Amino acid sequence: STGSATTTPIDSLDDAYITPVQIGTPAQTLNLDFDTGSSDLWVFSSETTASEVDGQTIYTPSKSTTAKLLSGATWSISYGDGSSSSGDVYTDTVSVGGLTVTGQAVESAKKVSSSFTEDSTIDGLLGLAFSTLNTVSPTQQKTFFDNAKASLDSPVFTADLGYHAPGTYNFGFIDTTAYTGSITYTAVSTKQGFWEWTSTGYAVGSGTFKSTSIDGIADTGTTLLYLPATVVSAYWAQVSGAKSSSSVGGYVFPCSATLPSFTFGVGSARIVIPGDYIDFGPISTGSSSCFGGIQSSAGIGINIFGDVALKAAFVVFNGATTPTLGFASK
């Protein structure tokens, strides 16, 4: 089997991407944030504290003839940005782009943090990291991809995120029309539960490529590119007036600037992030200070190849017995 679904930016800055997912019988379609950095499929629901729902579409398990309470199971997750959610668990039929999994754990939120309440466009998350990170207790549950994998034509999914435009998540096949050149594959460590790999270096604009190993994670659920402070300083030093602002929480730059590109290495291959992808717009409405799309990972404990990086590439998440990651230009 295969599936193919369009993923759409939630706003004009590409702050996140939402993908329609069918849950239950008859289908209830919710727009979920596909997140290769976590491993829980959770949704706003009829159980979510009413004051914490503000415009999201909710899953109502009592209206699904295939929903079953997973008795005794609870979940609770805290994300790296400080967001969180928790609740109980149903199993139900879940379909993405024509690919169906029966008995998928659907984690129903009883509580969500304010960041989720305030984003009316995100009805939940669909985790695509390794199932060892799933938070369901006392019986850990599998991700949608892990449940689907044996049925797929090939044990892979691909992320093709757009810049200020829709893109595609495919399951079970590699669309050879969606990229240019060849796909370069690189090793993955699953020891932390992430799609963790080592970039071979970077360049700023038209500058020379610096060969240096940068361990990090491919994370579709994180907006920006978080890299070591040395790398980030070298980037922003090429932008007149750019500075790190403690009060704003990162590097800012004059909105009048034209940003240089940023290149990262995948083996001997190179992925080029155009400068415009690194502009996240005014820090507050009407400001002439703009927020940078490349930020330091120093306070995080891990480097994160988030959407800013991944949207410059066609990315293969290869879930074979030994997982690997592939990157192609597009």
Ligand X SMILES: C[S@@](=O)c1ccc(CN)cc1
* Catalytic positions, written as ranges: 35, 199
Closest of 66, 224, 54 to residue 123, by C-alpha: 54
For residue 122, state whether it binds ligand X (rule: CB under 6 A): yes
DSSP string, 294-311: EEE-TTTSSEEE-HHHHT
Which range in 116-124, 145-153, 285-293, 312-320 contacts ligand X by CB under 6 A?
Answer: 116-124
Here's the x/- map for ligand X, 3-42, by CB under 6 A: it reads as -------------x----------------x-x-xx----
SS3 of 243, please? Answer: strand
Q: How far is CA 88 from CA 28, 46, 71, 179, 202, in A?
A: 18, 12, 9, 40, 43
- Smallest separation (angstroms) from ligand X to the CB of 207: 30
d(CA 327, CA 179): 9
Helices (H) and strands (E) in the chain, counts: 4, 24
Q: How far is CA 53 from the centre of its chain?
A: 22
- Smallest separation (angstroms) from ligand X to the CB of 256: 29
- How does strand 167-171 pair with strand 184-187? unpaired
Closest of 245, 191, 227 to residue 309, by C-alpha: 227
d(CA 284, CA 289): 8
- Smallest separation (angstroms) from ligand X to the CB of 37: 5
Nearer to ligand X, 130 or 179 (CB): 130
Which range in 64-72, 119-127, 175-183, 253-261 contacts ligand X by CB under 6 A?
Answer: 119-127
SS3 of 74, please? Answer: strand
Give the pair of three-digit tokens for residue 69. 């309470």
Nearer to ligand X, 222 or 318 (CB): 222
d(CA 248, CA 251): 8
Which range in 78-86, 200-208, 252-260, 261-269 contacts ligand X by CB under 6 A?
Answer: 78-86
Which 167-226 positions form the footprint of ligand X (CB under 6 A)? 221-222
Which 124-143 positions form the footprint of ligand X (CB under 6 A)? 125
Tell me if the bond preceding 26 is cis, omega within 30° of 0.
yes
Nearer to ligand X, 54 or 153 (CB): 54
For residue 116, state whether it binds ligand X (rule: CB under 6 A): yes
For residue 107, state whether it binds ligand X (rule: CB under 6 A): no
# of chain residues touching ligand X (CB under 6 A): 15
- Smallest separation (angstroms) from ligand X to the CB of 69: 26
Among 29, 83, 151, 190, binds ligand X (CB under 6 A): 83
Which range in 91-99, 112-120, 158-166, 265-273 contacts ligand X by CB under 6 A?
Answer: 112-120
Nearer to ligand X, 174 or 309 (CB): 309
**In this structure, which amino acid lies at residue 142?**
K
DSSP string, 145-205: HHHHGGGSSSSEEEEE--SSS-EEEEES---TTSSSS-PEEEE-B-TTSS-EEEEEEEEET
For residue 91, state whether it binds ligand X (rule: CB under 6 A): no
- Smallest separation (angstroms) from ligand X to the CB of 41: 13
Which range in 55-63, 117-125, 157-165, 237-245 contacts ligand X by CB under 6 A?
Answer: 117-125
Binding positions for ligand X, rule: CB under 6 A: 16, 33, 35, 37-38, 79, 81, 83, 115-116, 119, 122, 125, 221-222
